[PDB]
């Protein structure tokens, strides 16, 4: 039993909490900025948390739990003058250059300092910043003339990876953040995922920039450049136009894709029923010769990279089919030509990916054929919101249109791609009709749904059960292997997704605040818009997709073998044995 004042406000309770969540939870102003995650930065409190508690001092509320006989005050001079300076001594080791920077919109450390009407003792003006920039990586880009020293992607990084590739570092006798060794990180265990990114209040991480690639193949004469996005970008970019959450933004997208000077309109869920083909073909094909188990997918990068880094043993059970990403570029240079009449050359491929991870899979040497990448660039979910809003285009506004249908139609099945849970379930409904040769009616796979981390279930397969899981973060993957679960039964076919509720929480996603996040579940509302899609769907199985059916038909054949077989699949390999 404890009773606390707060700002005068005399408060019964019991629970057992920091003065921060109950008073963030009583509807009392607390400003925050380290805290993220249930974590603060414990090597390096910033203090903006700070409350005074009679007979104690100052306490940092984000990691101060109640005690019965408290009495706080969150507004009192003393406590203000502190928070400006910490604030102003931030200010003092920050490039403070709003106009240009790509977190103008919607930066935490700005409102912070507007709040408190801080300013730095010295301002801090770099003259080179090369030094402080690094741009090596094909997936993140990291500008510390921004870092606060906030520890937010470190705490990120090991919560959501557990790899740790985010570590304090000591450069030049200061301290940073980087990979191992200040390394590219690339050329670490880093899986290029982004979640440190999503992480940071500030510009300091960000995406490696494609937008110059895209701009430049817009404007050439010869290039026509097709665009097709990601499932999870219809349900995340309205948040960046302050259209709110959970809004689908299918056909503005589409229009404003076509006001940018896009020359075709495609879709990645039409990738997505492409590599349903040859996903559940290749189950079946395994179901039918009893081997070998399990079949895991490579479809997210950031979890190919994961079994590239700490399980190389695992790579010969990954699916050798392509990612809609890669399999939709592969048929880019390929079919689509051939019901076009464009040279293959000419042909100049963007996607719109909610994924840091995906630039790195899109510049993989292999992913090409005959000179011609399967991919030639990939913005996130954000550049394509800074493109729109560089050209003025009135998002909110516009009206809906539709994609061309010959790489742009999908089913429902693909539709859900982007939450956890969405390609196994996608899966299943096609490898059940191929297996069975029927035309099932029971399609919904909800024991496979949601944001539990490791989720298994048995399903029936032309008269025999076979053990599925659906892996949600890489963390979980971690714990999946390390505790030997992965022995505990014969497991056939599992998803492994690298970012917790899938796609929709990618790295390339837009930012939310921490106050935004503790009121809406970003998971689940994002991924409600892809569910919704399906259910109201005409056509819920990939092999019903119309375009596809007569892509397979009139130009690749049968799926898992022949042309298919030889163009839309990608094999993983562990390295060669070499020494040292
Ligand atoms: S990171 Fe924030 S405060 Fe710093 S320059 Fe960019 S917008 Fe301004
Ligand atoms: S990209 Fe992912 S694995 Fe790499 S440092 Fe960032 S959070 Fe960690
Ligand atoms: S990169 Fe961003 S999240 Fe990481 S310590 Fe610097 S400001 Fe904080
Ligand atoms: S879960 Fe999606 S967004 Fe996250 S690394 Fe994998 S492909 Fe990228
Ligand atoms: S928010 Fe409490 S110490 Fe940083
Ligand atoms: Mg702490
Ligand atoms: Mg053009």
């Known amino acids: ?115 408190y009407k801080a300013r730095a003792s010295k301002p801090f003006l770099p003259k080179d910043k090369t030094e402080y920039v690094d741009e090596r990586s ?79 193949a817009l404007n050439a004469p010869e290039k026509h450049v097709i665009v097709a996005m990601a499932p999870s970008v219809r349900a995340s ?45 290749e189950l079946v094909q395994r179901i039918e010769n009893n081997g070998p188990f399990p079949m895991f997918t490579s479809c997210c990068p950031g979890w190919v990279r994961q079994a590239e880094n700490y399980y190389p043993e695992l790579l010969n059970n ?22 076009s009449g464009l040279d293959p050359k000419n042909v100049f491929t963007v996607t719109v990916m909610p994924c840091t991870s995906k630039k790195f899979e899109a510049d993989r040497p292999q992913m090409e054929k005959d000179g011609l990448r399967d991919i030639d660039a990939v913005i996130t979910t954000r550049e394509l919101a800074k493109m729109i809003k ?23 099945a693909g539709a859900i791609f982007g939450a956890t849970g969405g390609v196994m379930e996608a899966a299943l409904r096609s490898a059940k009709d191929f297996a069975e040769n029927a035309e099932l009616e029971d399609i919904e796979y909800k024991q496979v749904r949601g944001l539990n981390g490791i989720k298994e279930a048995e399903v029936e397969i032309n008269n025999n059960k076979y053990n599925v899981a659906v892996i949600n973060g890489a963390s979980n993957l971690f714990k999946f292997m390390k505790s030997g679960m992965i022995n505990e039964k014969q497991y056939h076919f599992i998803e492994v997704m690298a970012c917790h509720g899938g796609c929709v929480n990618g790295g390339g996603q837009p930012h939310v605040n921490p106050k935004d996040l503790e009121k809406v579940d970003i998971k689940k509302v994002r991924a409600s818009v892809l569910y919704n899609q399906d259910e109201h769907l005409s056509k819920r199985k990939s092999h019903e997709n119309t375009a596809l059916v007569k892509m397979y038909q009139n130009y690749f054949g049968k799926p898992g073998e022949g042309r298919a077989h030889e163009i839309l699949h990608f094999k993983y390999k562990k390295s060669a044995w070499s020494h040292p």
């Open 1 to 115: 039993m404890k009773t606390i004042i707060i700002n005068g406000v005399q408060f019964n309770t019991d629970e057992d909490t920091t003065i921060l969540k109950f008073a963030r939870d009583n509807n009392i102003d607390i400003s925050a900025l380290c805290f993220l995650n249930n974590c603060n930065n414990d090597i390096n409190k910033c203090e903006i948390c700070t409350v005074e508690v009679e007979g104690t001092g100052l306490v940092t509320a984000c990691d101060t739990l109640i005690e019965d006989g408290m009495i706080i005050n969150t507004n009192s001079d003393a406590v203000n003058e502190k928070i400006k300076s910490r604030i102003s001594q931030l200010l003092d080791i920050h490039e403070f250059k709003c106009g240009p920077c790509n977190r103008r919109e919607n930066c935490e450390f700005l409102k912070l300092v507007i709040k």
């Open 318 to 339: 990954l699916s050798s089919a392509k990612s809609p990403q890669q399999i939709f570029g592969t048929a880019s240079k390929t079919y689509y030509p051939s019901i």
């Open 390 to 412: 560089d050209a003025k285009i009135p998002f909110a506004k516009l009206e809906d249109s539709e994609a061309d249908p010959a790489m742009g139609e999908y089913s429902g």
């Open 237 to 281: 970019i309205g948040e960046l136009f302050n259209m709110g959450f959970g809004v689908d933004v299918t056909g503005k997208i589409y229009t404003a894709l076509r006001q940018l000077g896009f020359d075709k309109i495609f879709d990645i869920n039409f990738g997505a029923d492409m590599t349903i083909m040859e996903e559940a073909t």
């Open 138 to 216: 094909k997936s993140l880009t990291v500008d510390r003339t921004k870092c606060l020293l906030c520890g937010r992607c470190v705490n990120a990084c090991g919560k959501n990876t557990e790899t740790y590739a985010m570590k304090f570092l000591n450069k030049n006798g200061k301290t940073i953040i980087g990979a191992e060794d200040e390394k590219c990180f690339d050329d670490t265990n880093c899986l290029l995922c982004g979640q440190c990114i999503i992480a940071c209040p500030v510009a300091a991480l960000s995406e490696k920039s494609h937008m110059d690639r895209v701009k430049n």
